C-alpha cells in the first residue's frame with residue numbers, strides 16, 4: 756500500500772534503493788518482483804552467510820553492487836517487461852521491514868510528419884506510453900485516430916486540412932512526458 760511511484764524510460768538504467776543506513780542490521784534482503792501478466796521473480800541476499808540467489812535470469816535484474824548498508828536493485832536496461840511492483844523485504848533480528856516501488860515504464864513515441872494531397876498534413880506518434888498528444892498550429896479540421904496495442908503503447912495518427920489559403924506552413928506538436936517533439940510541414 757505505502758509505496759514510491761517511479762517512472763523510468765525505455766533503455767535507461769533504473770536503481771531501486773531498499774534503504775541507505777549503516778544502522779539497519781539486515782540479516783536477509785529479498786526483492787520480490789511482480790507483474791500484471793508476466794510471472795514473478797526474486798533476488799535474495801544473505802548478509803550473515805554472504806550468499807545470494809536469483810530466479811530473475813534473463814530479466815536484466817541484479818544487485819547494483821554487493822548489498823551491505825545501501826542494498827539496491829538495478830535494471831541495466833529498462834523494457835516494458837519491467838513494469839510492476841518491486842518489494843524489498845528486510846529481515847533483521849527485531850523483525851521485518853519493507854520498501855515498495857511501483858515501477859512505470861515510459862516509451863517515447865516514434866514521430867513522423869508529412870504533407871498530403873490537397874493541402875493536408877499528417878502527424879504520427881507511433882507506439883508511445885502513455886499516448887502522446889497531437890496538436891496543430893494554426894487550428895485545422897482534423898481527424899485523430901488512436902490505436903491501443905496489447906503491450907500498453909498507443910499509436911496516435913492525425914490528418915488535418917486548413918480552409919484559409921493564407922496557410923502555407925503548419926506546425927505539429929507531439930507532447931509526451933518523455934519530451935515534446937515538433938516540426939513544421941510545408942503544405943502542397
Ligand SMILES: *[C@@H]1O[C@H](CO)[C@@H](O)[C@H](O)[C@H]1NC(C)=O
Nearest residue numbers: 756757758759760840856857
Ligand atoms: C502505490 O501508491 C499509489 C498512491 O497511493 C497507489 O495509487 C498505487 O496503487 C500503489 N501501488 C501499490 C503497488 O501498492
Ligand SMILES: *[C@@H]1O[C@H](CO)[C@@H](O)[C@H](O)[C@H]1NC(C)=O
Nearest residue numbers: 806807808809818820821822
Ligand atoms: C548473485 O548470484 C549470482 C549467481 O549465483 C552471482 O554471479 C553474483 O555474483 C551474486 N551477486 C552478488 C551481489 O554477490
Ligand SMILES: *[C@@H]1O[C@H](CO)[C@@H](O)[C@H](O)[C@H]1NC(C)=O
Nearest residue numbers: 813814815831832833834836
Ligand atoms: C539485457 O540488457 C542488455 C543491455 O544492457 C540488452 O542488450 C539485452 O538484450 C537485455 N536482455 C533482455 C532479455 O532484456
Ligand SMILES: *[C@@H]1O[C@H](CO)[C@@H](O)[C@H](O)[C@H]1NC(C)=O
Nearest residue numbers: 835862882904905906907908
Ligand atoms: C508495442 O507494440 C507496437 C505495436 O505492435 C510495436 O510497434 C512496438 O514496437 C511495441 N513496443 C515495444 C516497446 O515493444
Ligand SMILES: *[C@@H]1O[C@H](CO)[C@@H](O)[C@H](O)[C@H]1NC(C)=O
Nearest residue numbers: 890928929930931934935936
Ligand atoms: C510539452 O507541450 C505541452 C503542451 O503545449 C506543455 O504543456 C508542456 O509543458 C511541454 N513540455 C515541456 C517540457 O516543454
